[PDB]
């Protein structure tokens, strides 16, 4: 059950589910595992919000352990394409692709809550079959890794070398640490 | 949950601007829904472009072909956009868009390969189905050649095994026409 709420629009009052209601205030939730369906839903929401107001900020609230890179990248590219600034907010956790989308928010408008945590690392994958095919897929994931690292460098302001060094293994960042690292701009307080 | 807007669900809302989504695995039912959306849009305006936003790992060939044939039949140009990934049958439908109107987002990727299948039974029946999948493979390669501008020979060579293409490589290959850059 998603609770319903009353909205007072100038045409009289109306009924929305809580998430639809928040969407009207330009808030989009990115929650749980990142994959094709939840991603395209977020993409649709972003395009809609832009169509509604191309100038107003869009707010992407992130509580996610990450997930499929290609799915995440459909969100990333949409964030960069649309006119509105996408302000990102980390609540609970933003890990892997979740952390990447967090740092991909509009410069100056990326936030961590005081007790949210971030974790970064390199791509995970797996293939099975002939050596020739193994090489093809190994080569591809290494290319993906390189791109992710370049984009992380871009958004954090850290050097590519630092990013590479810091993402070879799981790396946790507290809210204050994420600010220092350049992954987020500030911590949200009261 | 699909969010509502002012009262439409988000996807129905975008369908109104003639945007159709192709999401995840390609199969009969999700494909038939896409066919219905294309036929409906055509009826509404036979002259207006239709848009197909693709984020897919591919899927069933016959299902994908129901979509392909529809795209080719209707009068509206079908513009295609690769978001995240378009692999296999997904890549095929991407390249099948109206020429000049096929796009990749800057960090999306594409993958192409040959038909996968299998059969079990008598040798006689195995030959029958083997012969068929070979014919299917031939048709898919010919159509890929047609849409990309590559020679059939080059297509055949490049699809024997999984082959990835970045957005720029997809442009250079003739799979899509350009990369979508920010407003």
């Amino acid at each position: 059950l998603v609770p319903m709420v009353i909205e007072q629009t100038s045409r009289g009052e109306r009924s929305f589910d809580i998430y639809s209601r928040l969407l009207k205030e330009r808030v989009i939730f990115l929650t749980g595992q990142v994959e094709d369906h939840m991603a395209n839903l977020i993409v649709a929401q972003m395009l809609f919000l832009e169509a509604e107001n191309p100038e107003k900020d869009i707010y992407l609230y992130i509580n996610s352990p990450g997930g499929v890179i290609t799915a995440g990248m459909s969100i990333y590219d949409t964030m960069q394409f649309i006119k509105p600034d996408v302000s990102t907010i980390c609540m609970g956790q933003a890990a892997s692709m979740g952390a990447f989308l967090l740092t991909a928010g509009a410069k100056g408008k990326r936030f961590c809550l005081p007790n949210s945590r971030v974790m970064i690392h390199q791509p995970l994958g797996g293939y099975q079959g002939q050596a020739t095919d193994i090489e093809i897929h190994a080569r591809e994931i290494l290319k993906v890794k390189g791109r992710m690292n370049e984009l992380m460098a871009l958004h954090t302001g850290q050097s590519l070398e630092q990013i590479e060094r810091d993402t070879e293994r799981d790396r946790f960042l507290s809210a204050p640490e994420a600010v220092e690292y350049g992954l987020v701009d500030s911590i949200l307080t009261h | 949950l699909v969010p509502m807007v002012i009262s439409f669900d988000i996807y129905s809302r975008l369908l109104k601007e003639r945007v159709i989504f192709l999401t995840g695995q390609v199969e009969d039912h999700m494909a038939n829904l896409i066919v219905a959306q294309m036929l409906f849009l055509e009826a509404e305006n036979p002259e207006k472009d239709i848009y197909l936003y693709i984020n897919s790992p591919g899927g069933v060939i016959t299902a994908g072909m129901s979509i392909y044939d529809t795209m080719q039949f209707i009068k509206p140009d079908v513009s295609t956009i690769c978001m995240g990934q378009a692999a296999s049958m997904g890549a095929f439908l991407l390249t099948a868009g109206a020429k000049g109107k096929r796009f990749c987002l800057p960090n999306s990727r594409v993958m192409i390969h040959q038909p996968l299948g299998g059969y079990q039974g008598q040798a006689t029946d195995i030959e029958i189905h083997a012969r068929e999948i070979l014919k299917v493979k031939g048709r898919m390669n010919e159509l890929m050649a047609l849409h990309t501008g590559q020679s059939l020979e080059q297509i055949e060579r490049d699809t024997e095994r999984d082959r990835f293409l970045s957005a720029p490589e997809a442009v250079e290959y003739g799979l899509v026409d350009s990369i979508l850059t920010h407003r």
Partner: peptide, 6 residues
Amino acid sequence: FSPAAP
């Protein structure tokens, strides 16, 4: 996706 997809 506008300018051209729409």
